[PDB]
Amino acid sequence: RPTFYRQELNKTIWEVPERYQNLSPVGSGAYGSVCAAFDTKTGHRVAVKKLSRPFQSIIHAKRTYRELRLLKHMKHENVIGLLDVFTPARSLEEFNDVYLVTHLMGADLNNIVKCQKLTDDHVQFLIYQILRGLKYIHSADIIHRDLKPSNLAVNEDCELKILDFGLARHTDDEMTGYVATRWYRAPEIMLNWMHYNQTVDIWSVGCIMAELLTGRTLFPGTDHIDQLKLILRLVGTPGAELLKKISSESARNYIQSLAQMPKMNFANVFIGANPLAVDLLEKMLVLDSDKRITAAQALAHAYFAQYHDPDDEPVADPYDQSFESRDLLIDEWKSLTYDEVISFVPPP
Numbered sequence: 001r002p003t004f005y006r007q008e009l010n011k012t013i014w015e016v017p018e019r020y021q022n023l024s025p026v027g028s029g030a031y032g033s034v035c036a037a038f039d040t041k042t043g044h045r046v047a048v049k050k051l052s053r054p055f056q057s058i059i060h061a062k063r064t065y066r067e068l069r070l071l072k073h074m075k076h077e078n079v080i081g082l083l084d085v086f087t088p089a090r091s092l093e094e095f096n097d098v099y100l101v102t103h104l105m106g107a108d109l110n111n112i113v114k115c116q117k118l119t120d121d122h123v124q125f126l127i128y129q130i131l132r133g134l135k136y137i138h139s140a141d142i143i144h145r146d147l148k149p150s151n152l153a154v155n156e157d158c159e160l161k162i163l164d165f166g167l168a169r170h171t172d173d174e175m176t177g178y179v180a181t182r183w184y185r186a187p188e189i190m191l192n193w194m195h196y197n198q199t200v201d202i203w204s205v206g207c208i209m210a211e212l213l214t215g216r217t218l219f220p221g222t223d224h225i226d227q228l229k230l231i232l233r234l235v236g237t238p239g240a241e242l243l244k245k246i247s248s249e250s251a252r253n254y255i256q257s258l259a260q261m262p263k264m265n266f267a268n269v270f271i272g273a274n275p276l277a278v279d280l281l282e283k284m285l286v287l288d289s290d291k292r293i294t295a296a297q298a299l300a301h302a303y304f305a306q307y308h309d310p311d312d313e314p315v316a317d318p319y320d321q322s323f324e325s326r327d328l329l330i331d332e333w334k335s336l337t338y339d340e341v342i343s344f345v346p347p348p
Protein backbone atom coordinates (compact mmCIF):
# COMPACT_ATOMS: atom_id res chain seq x y z
CA ARG A 1 0.00 0.00 0.00
CA PRO A 2 1.38 3.49 -0.83
CA THR A 3 1.43 6.35 1.71
CA PHE A 4 -1.46 8.82 1.20
CA TYR A 5 -1.56 12.58 1.99
CA ARG A 6 -4.66 14.91 2.47
CA GLN A 7 -5.53 18.42 1.24
CA GLU A 8 -8.71 20.55 0.78
CA LEU A 9 -9.27 21.67 -2.88
CA ASN A 10 -12.40 23.89 -3.48
CA LYS A 11 -14.35 22.61 -0.38
CA THR A 12 -13.38 18.90 -1.08
CA ILE A 13 -10.95 16.64 0.95
CA TRP A 14 -8.52 14.88 -1.52
CA GLU A 15 -6.53 11.89 -0.13
CA VAL A 16 -4.06 10.56 -2.78
CA PRO A 17 -0.79 8.55 -2.99
CA GLU A 18 2.49 10.60 -2.63
CA ARG A 19 3.41 9.84 -6.30
CA TYR A 20 0.72 12.43 -7.36
CA GLN A 21 2.06 16.04 -6.87
CA ASN A 22 0.96 19.68 -7.68
CA LEU A 23 -2.83 18.98 -7.69
CA SER A 24 -4.83 21.87 -9.31
CA PRO A 25 -8.63 21.94 -9.90
CA VAL A 26 -9.70 21.82 -13.60
CA GLY A 27 -13.47 21.05 -13.46
CA SER A 28 -16.51 19.33 -11.87
CA GLY A 29 -19.52 17.59 -13.46
CA ALA A 30 -22.29 16.14 -11.20
CA TYR A 31 -20.50 12.69 -11.43
CA GLY A 32 -17.24 14.04 -9.83
CA SER A 33 -14.45 16.68 -9.38
CA VAL A 34 -11.21 16.64 -11.53
CA CYS A 35 -7.63 17.85 -10.68
CA ALA A 36 -4.56 18.06 -12.97
CA ALA A 37 -1.44 16.54 -11.32
CA PHE A 38 2.15 15.40 -12.06
CA ASP A 39 2.67 11.63 -11.71
CA THR A 40 6.28 11.19 -10.36
CA LYS A 41 6.30 7.36 -11.02
CA THR A 42 5.66 7.77 -14.82
CA GLY A 43 6.53 11.42 -15.69
CA HIS A 44 2.99 11.92 -17.21
CA ARG A 45 0.72 14.96 -16.56
CA VAL A 46 -2.56 13.26 -15.45
CA ALA A 47 -6.24 13.94 -14.71
CA VAL A 48 -7.31 12.65 -11.24
CA LYS A 49 -11.12 12.30 -10.95
CA LYS A 50 -12.72 11.90 -7.48
CA LEU A 51 -16.21 10.36 -7.91
CA SER A 52 -19.07 12.18 -6.06
CA ARG A 53 -21.47 10.01 -3.95
CA PRO A 54 -20.46 6.87 -5.96
CA PHE A 55 -22.71 4.49 -3.85
CA GLN A 56 -25.63 6.85 -2.91
CA SER A 57 -28.35 4.74 -4.74
CA ILE A 58 -28.58 1.40 -6.66
CA ILE A 59 -28.52 3.39 -9.96
CA HIS A 60 -25.36 5.36 -8.87
CA ALA A 61 -23.58 2.22 -7.45
CA LYS A 62 -24.20 0.32 -10.73
CA ARG A 63 -23.01 3.37 -12.81
CA THR A 64 -19.73 3.44 -10.73
CA TYR A 65 -19.20 -0.33 -11.41
CA ARG A 66 -20.03 0.16 -15.19
CA GLU A 67 -17.50 3.05 -15.59
CA LEU A 68 -14.64 1.14 -13.83
CA ARG A 69 -15.28 -2.09 -15.83
CA LEU A 70 -15.28 -0.11 -19.14
CA LEU A 71 -12.09 1.94 -18.39
CA LYS A 72 -10.21 -1.20 -17.17
CA HIS A 73 -11.01 -2.96 -20.50
CA MET A 74 -10.04 -0.25 -23.08
CA LYS A 75 -6.40 -0.86 -24.33
CA HIS A 76 -6.04 0.89 -27.75
CA GLU A 77 -3.90 3.82 -29.12
CA ASN A 78 -7.06 5.81 -30.17
CA VAL A 79 -9.09 5.23 -26.92
CA ILE A 80 -8.64 6.75 -23.39
CA GLY A 81 -7.20 4.08 -21.02
CA LEU A 82 -6.95 3.78 -17.22
CA LEU A 83 -3.49 4.69 -15.79
CA ASP A 84 -4.52 4.02 -12.13
CA VAL A 85 -7.51 3.56 -9.75
CA PHE A 86 -7.21 3.92 -5.93
CA THR A 87 -9.09 4.29 -2.64
CA PRO A 88 -7.61 5.35 0.72
CA ALA A 89 -9.80 2.66 2.43
CA ARG A 90 -7.84 -0.30 3.99
CA SER A 91 -10.92 -2.69 3.91
CA LEU A 92 -14.41 -3.13 2.28
CA GLU A 93 -15.92 -2.07 5.65
CA GLU A 94 -14.42 1.49 5.38
CA PHE A 95 -14.69 1.81 1.50
CA ASN A 96 -16.50 5.06 0.45
CA ASP A 97 -14.32 6.89 -2.16
CA VAL A 98 -13.08 6.04 -5.71
CA TYR A 99 -10.39 7.98 -7.68
CA LEU A 100 -9.68 7.39 -11.44
CA VAL A 101 -6.38 8.47 -13.18
CA THR A 102 -5.99 9.11 -16.98
CA HIS A 103 -3.55 11.03 -19.32
CA LEU A 104 -4.22 14.81 -19.09
CA MET A 105 -5.82 15.92 -22.38
CA GLY A 106 -4.86 19.33 -23.87
CA ALA A 107 -6.92 20.31 -26.93
CA ASP A 108 -10.22 18.75 -28.17
CA LEU A 109 -11.50 18.67 -31.80
CA ASN A 110 -13.72 21.72 -30.97
CA ASN A 111 -10.60 23.86 -30.35
CA ILE A 112 -8.85 22.85 -33.66
CA VAL A 113 -12.22 23.06 -35.88
CA LYS A 114 -13.06 26.55 -34.47
CA CYS A 115 -9.51 28.09 -34.44
CA GLN A 116 -7.47 26.24 -37.16
CA LYS A 117 -7.49 25.74 -40.99
CA LEU A 118 -7.69 21.99 -41.83
CA THR A 119 -6.45 20.53 -45.18
CA ASP A 120 -8.07 17.40 -46.74
CA ASP A 121 -4.91 15.52 -45.52
CA HIS A 122 -5.71 16.56 -41.87
CA VAL A 123 -9.38 15.42 -42.30
CA GLN A 124 -8.27 11.95 -43.72
CA PHE A 125 -5.89 11.41 -40.67
CA LEU A 126 -8.35 12.59 -37.94
CA ILE A 127 -11.37 10.58 -39.27
CA TYR A 128 -9.06 7.53 -39.91
CA GLN A 129 -8.11 7.53 -36.17
CA ILE A 130 -11.78 7.87 -34.94
CA LEU A 131 -12.75 4.83 -37.14
CA ARG A 132 -9.63 2.78 -36.01
CA GLY A 133 -10.75 3.39 -32.37
CA LEU A 134 -14.44 2.54 -33.22
CA LYS A 135 -13.50 -0.76 -34.98
CA TYR A 136 -11.85 -1.74 -31.60
CA ILE A 137 -14.82 -0.47 -29.38
CA HIS A 138 -17.48 -2.13 -31.62
CA SER A 139 -15.54 -5.51 -31.76
CA ALA A 140 -16.24 -5.74 -27.92
CA ASP A 141 -20.00 -5.00 -28.55
CA ILE A 142 -19.59 -1.61 -26.78
CA ILE A 143 -21.62 1.42 -28.10
CA HIS A 144 -20.04 4.88 -27.32
CA ARG A 145 -23.44 6.74 -27.77
CA ASP A 146 -21.95 10.29 -27.18
CA LEU A 147 -19.37 10.98 -29.96
CA LYS A 148 -18.99 14.76 -30.56
CA PRO A 149 -15.96 17.15 -30.98
CA SER A 150 -15.64 17.84 -27.16
CA ASN A 151 -15.20 14.02 -26.57
CA LEU A 152 -12.22 13.72 -29.05
CA ALA A 153 -8.82 14.86 -27.61
CA VAL A 154 -5.70 15.38 -29.84
CA ASN A 155 -1.95 16.04 -29.12
CA GLU A 156 0.69 18.18 -30.98
CA ASP A 157 1.53 15.10 -33.21
CA CYS A 158 -2.16 15.05 -34.45
CA GLU A 159 -2.71 11.76 -32.43
CA LEU A 160 -6.45 11.38 -31.51
CA LYS A 161 -8.10 9.64 -28.48
CA ILE A 162 -11.84 8.88 -27.99
CA LEU A 163 -13.07 9.66 -24.41
CA ASP A 164 -16.20 10.21 -22.21
CA PHE A 165 -18.18 7.05 -23.13
CA GLY A 166 -22.00 7.32 -22.63
CA LEU A 167 -22.30 5.57 -19.18
CA ALA A 168 -25.56 7.17 -17.88
CA ARG A 169 -28.81 8.43 -19.51
CA HIS A 170 -28.61 12.20 -20.33
CA THR A 171 -31.13 14.51 -18.53
CA ASP A 172 -34.13 15.65 -20.69
CA ASP A 173 -32.97 19.24 -19.87
CA GLU A 174 -29.42 18.54 -21.25
CA MET A 175 -30.94 17.45 -24.66
CA THR A 176 -33.42 20.48 -24.93
CA GLY A 177 -33.14 23.42 -27.43
CA TYR A 178 -30.09 24.85 -29.32
CA VAL A 179 -27.44 22.48 -27.83
CA ALA A 180 -24.32 20.58 -29.12
CA THR A 181 -25.30 17.66 -26.81
CA ARG A 182 -28.01 16.67 -29.45
CA TRP A 183 -26.56 17.88 -32.84
CA TYR A 184 -24.44 14.70 -33.35
CA ARG A 185 -27.15 12.11 -32.30
CA ALA A 186 -28.70 9.61 -34.80
CA PRO A 187 -32.43 10.31 -35.45
CA GLU A 188 -33.50 6.78 -34.15
CA ILE A 189 -32.04 7.59 -30.68
CA MET A 190 -32.98 11.34 -30.63
CA LEU A 191 -36.72 10.40 -31.17
CA ASN A 192 -36.75 6.84 -29.63
CA TRP A 193 -37.86 5.20 -32.97
CA MET A 194 -36.59 1.64 -32.17
CA HIS A 195 -33.99 -0.44 -30.26
CA TYR A 196 -30.67 1.13 -31.40
CA ASN A 197 -27.25 -0.54 -31.84
CA GLN A 198 -23.59 0.40 -32.66
CA THR A 199 -24.65 2.03 -36.05
CA VAL A 200 -25.63 5.19 -34.00
CA ASP A 201 -21.83 5.95 -33.62
CA ILE A 202 -21.26 5.96 -37.46
CA TRP A 203 -24.04 8.67 -37.84
CA SER A 204 -22.05 10.80 -35.31
CA VAL A 205 -18.77 10.28 -37.26
CA GLY A 206 -20.59 11.50 -40.45
CA CYS A 207 -21.70 14.70 -38.59
CA ILE A 208 -18.09 15.34 -37.23
CA MET A 209 -16.45 14.70 -40.70
CA ALA A 210 -18.93 17.15 -42.40
CA GLU A 211 -18.03 19.86 -39.77
CA LEU A 212 -14.21 19.32 -40.31
CA LEU A 213 -14.75 19.81 -44.11
CA THR A 214 -17.02 23.00 -43.89
CA GLY A 215 -16.07 24.50 -40.46
CA ARG A 216 -19.86 24.58 -39.67
CA THR A 217 -22.20 22.30 -37.64
CA LEU A 218 -24.11 19.96 -40.08
CA PHE A 219 -27.51 19.81 -38.19
CA PRO A 220 -27.63 22.73 -35.67
CA GLY A 221 -31.32 22.30 -34.75
CA THR A 222 -33.10 24.73 -32.34
CA ASP A 223 -35.04 21.68 -30.87
CA HIS A 224 -35.69 17.96 -31.66
CA ILE A 225 -38.29 18.72 -34.44
CA ASP A 226 -36.26 21.53 -36.15
CA GLN A 227 -33.21 19.14 -36.15
CA LEU A 228 -35.32 16.28 -37.71
CA LYS A 229 -36.46 18.71 -40.53
CA LEU A 230 -32.75 19.66 -41.20
CA ILE A 231 -31.85 15.92 -41.38
CA LEU A 232 -34.75 14.85 -43.73
CA ARG A 233 -34.05 17.84 -46.10
CA LEU A 234 -30.46 16.45 -46.67
CA VAL A 235 -31.07 12.61 -46.66
CA GLY A 236 -34.76 12.51 -47.82
CA THR A 237 -37.93 11.33 -46.03
CA PRO A 238 -38.27 7.62 -45.09
CA GLY A 239 -39.66 5.01 -47.50
CA ALA A 240 -42.12 2.17 -46.58
CA GLU A 241 -39.21 -0.14 -45.65
CA LEU A 242 -37.80 2.09 -42.84
CA LEU A 243 -41.36 3.17 -41.63
CA LYS A 244 -42.09 -0.56 -40.89
CA LYS A 245 -38.97 -0.62 -38.53
CA ILE A 246 -40.24 2.31 -36.39
CA SER A 247 -41.79 0.28 -33.47
CA SER A 248 -43.24 3.53 -32.02
CA GLU A 249 -46.75 3.94 -33.61
CA SER A 250 -47.04 7.70 -32.74
CA ALA A 251 -43.47 8.37 -34.15
CA ARG A 252 -44.60 6.63 -37.43
CA ASN A 253 -47.78 8.78 -37.61
CA TYR A 254 -45.82 12.05 -37.15
CA ILE A 255 -43.25 11.18 -39.92
CA GLN A 256 -46.12 10.50 -42.41
CA SER A 257 -47.52 14.00 -41.69
CA LEU A 258 -44.41 15.48 -43.44
CA ALA A 259 -44.38 16.23 -47.22
CA GLN A 260 -42.07 13.78 -49.08
CA MET A 261 -38.56 15.09 -50.02
CA PRO A 262 -35.78 13.40 -52.08
CA LYS A 263 -32.13 12.94 -50.94
CA MET A 264 -30.02 16.02 -51.96
CA ASN A 265 -26.90 15.96 -54.21
CA PHE A 266 -23.99 15.88 -51.62
CA ALA A 267 -21.48 17.30 -54.25
CA ASN A 268 -23.70 20.46 -54.31
CA VAL A 269 -23.82 20.63 -50.43
CA PHE A 270 -20.03 19.94 -49.74
CA ILE A 271 -18.83 22.26 -52.55
CA GLY A 272 -15.19 21.59 -53.60
CA ALA A 273 -14.63 18.64 -51.21
CA ASN A 274 -12.61 15.58 -52.35
CA PRO A 275 -15.07 13.35 -54.31
CA LEU A 276 -13.90 10.38 -52.16
CA ALA A 277 -14.90 12.40 -48.99
CA VAL A 278 -18.39 13.07 -50.54
CA ASP A 279 -18.77 9.31 -51.36
CA LEU A 280 -17.94 8.25 -47.75
CA LEU A 281 -20.38 10.85 -46.23
CA GLU A 282 -23.19 9.43 -48.45
CA LYS A 283 -22.40 5.94 -46.94
CA MET A 284 -22.38 7.15 -43.27
CA LEU A 285 -25.40 9.57 -43.37
CA VAL A 286 -28.06 6.95 -44.28
CA LEU A 287 -31.39 7.30 -42.42
CA ASP A 288 -31.94 3.47 -42.15
CA SER A 289 -29.28 2.28 -39.62
CA ASP A 290 -29.24 -1.30 -41.16
CA LYS A 291 -27.76 0.21 -44.39
CA ARG A 292 -24.99 2.44 -42.91
CA ILE A 293 -21.29 1.59 -43.56
CA THR A 294 -19.58 -0.12 -40.52
CA ALA A 295 -16.25 1.07 -38.98
CA ALA A 296 -14.36 -2.00 -40.39
CA GLN A 297 -15.86 -1.39 -43.92
CA ALA A 298 -15.06 2.41 -43.72
CA LEU A 299 -11.31 1.74 -42.90
CA ALA A 300 -11.04 -0.01 -46.36
CA HIS A 301 -12.62 2.98 -48.25
CA ALA A 302 -10.29 4.62 -50.84
CA TYR A 303 -10.49 8.01 -48.92
CA PHE A 304 -8.03 6.44 -46.33
CA ALA A 305 -5.57 4.80 -48.91
CA GLN A 306 -2.62 6.83 -47.44
CA TYR A 307 -3.19 5.47 -43.85
CA HIS A 308 -5.07 2.08 -44.02
CA ASP A 309 -3.03 -0.97 -42.82
CA PRO A 310 -5.18 -4.05 -42.13
CA ASP A 311 -2.30 -5.60 -40.03
CA ASP A 312 -2.31 -2.53 -37.63
CA GLU A 313 -6.08 -2.07 -36.94
CA PRO A 314 -6.58 -4.33 -33.89
CA VAL A 315 -9.79 -5.76 -32.27
CA ALA A 316 -10.63 -5.97 -28.52
CA ASP A 317 -10.56 -8.89 -26.05
CA PRO A 318 -14.11 -10.21 -25.43
CA TYR A 319 -16.08 -8.02 -22.94
CA ASP A 320 -18.65 -9.62 -20.54
CA GLN A 321 -21.59 -7.19 -19.93
CA SER A 322 -23.94 -9.79 -18.31
CA PHE A 323 -23.91 -7.52 -15.16
CA GLU A 324 -26.13 -5.04 -17.12
CA SER A 325 -29.23 -7.33 -16.68
CA ARG A 326 -28.42 -8.28 -13.04
CA ASP A 327 -30.52 -6.97 -10.10
CA LEU A 328 -28.29 -6.38 -6.98
CA LEU A 329 -28.38 -4.36 -3.70
CA ILE A 330 -26.16 -1.24 -3.16
CA ASP A 331 -23.68 -3.16 -0.92
CA GLU A 332 -23.36 -5.97 -3.62
CA TRP A 333 -22.50 -3.37 -6.39
CA LYS A 334 -20.07 -1.72 -3.89
CA SER A 335 -18.34 -5.11 -3.12
CA LEU A 336 -17.98 -5.86 -6.92
CA THR A 337 -16.45 -2.35 -7.38
CA TYR A 338 -13.99 -2.87 -4.42
CA ASP A 339 -12.76 -6.15 -6.00
CA GLU A 340 -12.09 -4.36 -9.37
CA VAL A 341 -10.10 -1.54 -7.51
CA ILE A 342 -7.84 -4.05 -5.66
CA SER A 343 -7.21 -6.31 -8.76
CA PHE A 344 -6.11 -3.40 -11.04
CA VAL A 345 -2.70 -3.95 -12.78
CA PRO A 346 -1.16 -0.83 -14.38
CA PRO A 347 -0.05 -0.72 -18.01
CA PRO A 348 3.59 -1.72 -18.85
Ligand SMILES: Cc1noc2c1[C@@H](O)[C@@]13CNC[C@@H]1C[C@@H]2N3C
Pocket residue numbers: 107112116122154155156157158159
Ligand atom coordinates in the same frame (compact mmCIF):
# COMPACT_ATOMS: atom_id res chain seq x y z
C1 LIG B 1 -3.20 21.01 -31.00
C2 LIG B 1 -3.28 21.69 -32.30
N1 LIG B 1 -3.60 23.00 -32.46
O1 LIG B 1 -3.55 23.30 -33.77
C3 LIG B 1 -3.19 22.17 -34.47
C4 LIG B 1 -3.02 21.12 -33.58
C5 LIG B 1 -2.69 19.75 -34.07
O2 LIG B 1 -3.58 18.78 -33.56
C6 LIG B 1 -2.82 19.76 -35.62
C7 LIG B 1 -2.45 18.39 -36.21
N2 LIG B 1 -3.37 18.25 -37.32
C8 LIG B 1 -4.63 19.00 -37.14
C9 LIG B 1 -4.29 20.07 -36.09
C10 LIG B 1 -4.23 21.51 -36.62
C11 LIG B 1 -2.95 22.07 -35.94
N3 LIG B 1 -1.95 20.93 -36.05
C12 LIG B 1 -1.36 20.83 -37.41
Ligand SMILES: [Cl-]
Pocket residue numbers: 002003017018019020
Ligand atom coordinates in the same frame (compact mmCIF):
# COMPACT_ATOMS: atom_id res chain seq x y z
CL1 LIG C 1 3.05 6.87 -3.83
Ligand SMILES: [Cl-]
Pocket residue numbers: 079080081082103
Ligand atom coordinates in the same frame (compact mmCIF):
# COMPACT_ATOMS: atom_id res chain seq x y z
CL1 LIG D 1 -4.57 6.47 -22.81
Ligand SMILES: [Cl-]
Pocket residue numbers: 087088089094095096097098
Ligand atom coordinates in the same frame (compact mmCIF):
# COMPACT_ATOMS: atom_id res chain seq x y z
CL1 LIG E 1 -12.62 5.51 1.17
Ligand SMILES: [Cl-]
Pocket residue numbers: 110148149150151180
Ligand atom coordinates in the same frame (compact mmCIF):
# COMPACT_ATOMS: atom_id res chain seq x y z
CL1 LIG F 1 -19.04 19.16 -28.85
Ligand SMILES: [Cl-]
Pocket residue numbers: 318319320321
Ligand atom coordinates in the same frame (compact mmCIF):
# COMPACT_ATOMS: atom_id res chain seq x y z
CL1 LIG G 1 -14.91 -9.41 -19.62
Ligand SMILES: [Mg+2]
Pocket residue numbers: 150151164
Ligand atom coordinates in the same frame (compact mmCIF):
# COMPACT_ATOMS: atom_id res chain seq x y z
MG1 LIG H 1 -17.26 15.26 -22.48
